[PDB]
Design a protein around this ligand. Structure first.
Ligand SMILES: [Mg+2]
Ligand SMILES: [Zn+2]
Lengths: 167, 56, 111, 347, 34, 146
């Protein structure tokens, strides 16, 4: 809802990309391939997250393989489109109103689930868990912290983590 | 009180977790944390003794 | 969390009785400010008095005498005789309780 | 090969690489001439000694560094300054091809590496709890003996009731470094301990923590029995806590599943791998980078939190009575009488 | 056999200064009679 | 793995190192004394070796001013200490001593209610305020090398 913050995000993202490029010195001229930044870090990339409108050129979408027959040219996404534009992160982050509506729901649903799982006499399983794993006000996977019993004595920790800046 | 000691030492050791270059005072701090983990009742006696006596 | 705090504050404004009605002449005022030098101006003797209201007198004396230290930076040394050190582990508690006292000053005991 | 009479004995000088292979070790700079008539014809001082078969040999025997040995030398002092352009670190690396000091390469390799490795290994062996003929070696915590592996019990208060260990005879430092004959016998102890704790109504969690593979720690394969109402909640705890372990924005995609891939063909020979297996079904594995954001225990902490045990158990242990309290071996040996597979002399 | 015992001499700083001046670690010898 | 009791050898080396390096280079002084750090050297100097620290017996007007200020600024010995002209550790020690000499006279006689509340199996939190161990006749290799 803020346009100035989106423009600042684009400018800052270009700044750190230009810093990497000057680390390769690379030059002022463009067409530095953005696959080196935005590849996940498991395929060798930097793992870089985007919050801007960056598009990849169509000349990056060529690949090939040498089989027994010879060489085969495979191509990604060719019909007529230019819709290859770096998935950005707002689509993949749940808003707060959605979170607050969803969280009461998932905590009541988990309460029903472990209430019927204790009367049907079986311990809770990874699947029924994995239905509601990343949802809640304190996030249902925090029931399964290494130590929930010694964190029940941890009171007033928010003001503590705000005042750690003076320490 | 042992739960509170574990929580206190976790909050103190969260500070020197990111870095790896530590001088003498940091080393002393982590050594006191490890002694407080390894013998909690001596550390609790010491904490309560400082709370009763020390004012400077 | 603070965004949950903002959301709760918004719906708390919404759930006041006839909050948006301006027919007979009514105004809604929102005030946002700070306690400007709240840390800087805590008297340590008065702080000792208020902490002896709250905790054991040994604990209150410890917390008061801990704020009276010598501050060092390279060539410079002085004594914190007046304010509080924000960098103490328990300074969170001193700040929230002295803030409670001044919430009592602003609101009054009845409200 | 090399001898190096270590205070009376004879030790065959050998070097280990990253992958745990053990190779036999055979036994002022002058700026050589890295040109010809106006044309550059070699880079290092020995680009005409090496043949193709010699390159194949030195590529197989050669450890996986080859940058480090040059970067150590050109990182040191009294060595000018890269002035941006015209003299980068590239042509600085071209200029540091000297004429090593009459087999000084083999001297530094043999002396540094062989002696250092031997010295470290000897120290570890001397103070190893395992490797029978050592200094500490409680020797009454032994319950089993096999062809090549044996059961032991931990030297400390032993976190749970039937806490036991599956230890090989020799230092081997990993399960991926094991040969198949040792591994198939560790799997027999594993399949016997599961059947012992299943009829007793318990459950099994087999831990294997393997830290940095250059300090030569002995392999030990944990076995921690906890009750079945807690062991059905056990993959949830380890699944939550592996992904909230190591350095965030990691490379290797934390929490390798081991449901049917059983770390021998999941984690490459050479790199650390914490692993946990639940009973007879394989559980998870976590390739360890960043050896400071990952504790050397990590598994007894998760088990010790789900059993609500104090932290003095898993880190540093609590010692016991040196013969008296350590006769839980007597209690464990009457548990492991029906399920012993290492003998037949029971007439 | 080492014996912890309260002493009699009790070395002071001016003794350290006297012994440091007599080390003569900057006093070069005079050049030889040539 | 630093600190402990201050011995006399360390204090005399501390004085000579003050005479060479001054009161603003405590990390040059603490490289001259092993098992002591820069903060410990500075603390020891300002609390027991600075020749302004009145180590004599407390007078009557000093302890009158002490009781006045200690009733007047509760547990503020770093603020009281430059006013009455003694070190804050000395000031606190003598205040607790004067309180013990009246709380004893009000109720008790010698003993009776809680024999020991002192500190065993522990490291003293401020050894810089304590006098120096004299030097043991057979000095070890550490002290002679130092
Ligand atoms: Mg220069
Ligand atoms: Zn061994």
């Amino acid at each position: 809802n803020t346009q100035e913050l989106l423009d600042l995000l684009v400018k800052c993202e270009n700044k750190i990309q230009t810093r990497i490029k000057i680390g390769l010195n690379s030059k002022m001229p463009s067409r530095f391939p953005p696959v080196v930044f935005y590849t996940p870090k498991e395929l060798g990339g930097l793992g870089m997250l985007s919050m801007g409108h960056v598009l990849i050129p169509q000349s990056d979408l060529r690949w090939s393989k040498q089989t027994d027959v010879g060489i085969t040219h495979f191509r990604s996404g060719m019909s007529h489109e230019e819709d290859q534009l770096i998935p950005n992160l707002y689509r993949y982050i749940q808003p707060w109103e959605s979170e607050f509506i969803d969280s009461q729901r998932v905590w009541a649903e988990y309460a029903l689930k472990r209430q019927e799982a204790i009367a049907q006499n079986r311990r809770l399983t990874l699947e029924d868990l994995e239905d509601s794993w990343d949802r809640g006000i304190p996030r249902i996977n925090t029931l399964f912290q290494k130590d929930r019993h010694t964190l029940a004595y941890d009171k007033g920790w928010r003001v503590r983590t705000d005042f750690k800046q003076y320490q | 009180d042992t739960k509170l000691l574990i929580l206190a030492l976790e909050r103190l050791k969260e500070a020197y977790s990111v870095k790896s270059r530590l001088n003498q005072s940091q080393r002393e701090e982590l050594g006191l944390i490890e002694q407080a983990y390894d013998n909690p009742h001596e550390a609790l006696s010491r904490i309560k003794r400082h709370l009763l006596t020390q004012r400077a | 969390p603070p965004p949950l705090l903002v959301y709760k504050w918004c719906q708390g404004i919404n759930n006041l009785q006839d909050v948006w009605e301006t027919s007979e002449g009514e105004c809604n005022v929102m005030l946002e400010s700070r306690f400007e030098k709240m840390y800087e101006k805590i008297d340590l003797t008065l702080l000792n008095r208020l902490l002896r209201l709250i905790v054991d007198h040994n604990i209150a004396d410890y917390m008061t005498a801990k704020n009276n230290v010598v501050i060092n930076y390279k060539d410079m040394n002085h004594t914190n005789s007046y304010g509080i050190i924000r960098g103490l582990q328990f300074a969170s508690f001193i700040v929230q309780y002295y803030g409670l006292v001044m919430d009592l000053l602003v609101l009054g005991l009845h409200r | 090969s090399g001898v190096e009479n270590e205070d009376q004995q004879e030790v065959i000088l050998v070097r280990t690489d990253q992958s745990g292979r053990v190779w036999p070790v055979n036994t002022k700079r002058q700026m050589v001439s890295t040109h010809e008539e106006r044309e550059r014809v070699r880079y290092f001082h020995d680009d005409d000694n090496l043949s193709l078969n010699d390159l194949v040999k030195n590529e197989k025997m050669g450890t996986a560094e080859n940058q480090n040995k040059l970067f150590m030398r050109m990182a040191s002092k009294f060595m000018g300054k890269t002035d941006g352009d015209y003299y980068t670190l590239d042509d600085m690396f071209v200029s540091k091809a000297a004429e090593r000091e009459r087999l000084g390469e083999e001297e530094e390799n043999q002396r540094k590496k062989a002696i250092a490795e031997h010295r470290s290994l000897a120290a570890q062996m001397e103070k190893c709890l395992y490797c029978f003929d050592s200094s500490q070696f409680p020797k009454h915590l032994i319950v089993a003996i096999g062809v090549k592996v044996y059961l032991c019990l931990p030297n400390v208060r032993s976190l749970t009731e039937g806490h036991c260990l599956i230890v090989p005879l020799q230092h081997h430092r990993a399960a991926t470094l094991l040969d198949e004959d040792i591994w198939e016998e560790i799997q027999m102890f594993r399949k016997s301990l599961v059947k012992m704790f299943e009829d007793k109504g318990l459950d099994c969690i087999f831990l294997e923590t393997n830290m940095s593979m250059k300090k030569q720690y002995h392999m030990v394969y944990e076995c921690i029995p906890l009750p079945k109402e807690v062991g059905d909640m056990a993959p949830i705890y380890f699944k939550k806590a592996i992904m909230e372990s190591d350095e965030e924005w990691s490379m290797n995609k934390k929490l390798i599943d081991l449901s049917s891939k059983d770390i021998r063909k999941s984690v490459p020979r050479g790199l650390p791998y914490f692993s946990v297996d639940f009973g007879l079904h394989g559980g998870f594995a976590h390739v360890i980078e960043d050896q400071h954001k990952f504790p050397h225990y990590f598994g007894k902490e998760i088990i010790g939190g789900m059993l609500d045990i104090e932290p003095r158990l898993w880190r540093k242990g609590i010692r016991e009575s040196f013969e008296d309290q350590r006769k839980k071996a007597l209690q464990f040996a009457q548990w492991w009488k029906p399920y012993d597979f290492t003998k037949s002399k029971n007439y | 056999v080492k014996n912890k015992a309260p002493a009699e001499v009790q070395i002071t700083a001016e003794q350290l200064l006297r012994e440091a001046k007599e080390r003569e670690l900057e006093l070069l010898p005079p050049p030889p009679q040539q | 793995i630093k600190g402990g009791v201050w011995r006399n050898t360390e204090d005399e080396i501390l004085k000579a190192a003050v005479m060479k390096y001054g009161k603003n280079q405590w990390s040059r002084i603490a490289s001259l004394l092993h098992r002591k750090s820069a903060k410990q050297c500075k603390a020891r100097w300002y609390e027991w070796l600075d020749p302004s620290i009145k180590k004599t017996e407390w007078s009557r007007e000093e302890e009158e001013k002490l009781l006045h200020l200690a009733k007047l600024m509760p547990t503020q010995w770093r603020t009281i200490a430059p006013i009455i002209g003694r070190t804050a550790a000395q000031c606190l020690e003598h205040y607790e001593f004067l309180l013990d000499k009246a709380a004893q006279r009000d109720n008790e006689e010698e003993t009776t209610d809680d024999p020991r509340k002192l500190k065993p199996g522990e490291i003293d939190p401020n050894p810089e305020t304590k006098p120096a161990r004299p030097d043991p006749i057979d000095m070890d290799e550490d002290e002679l090398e130092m």
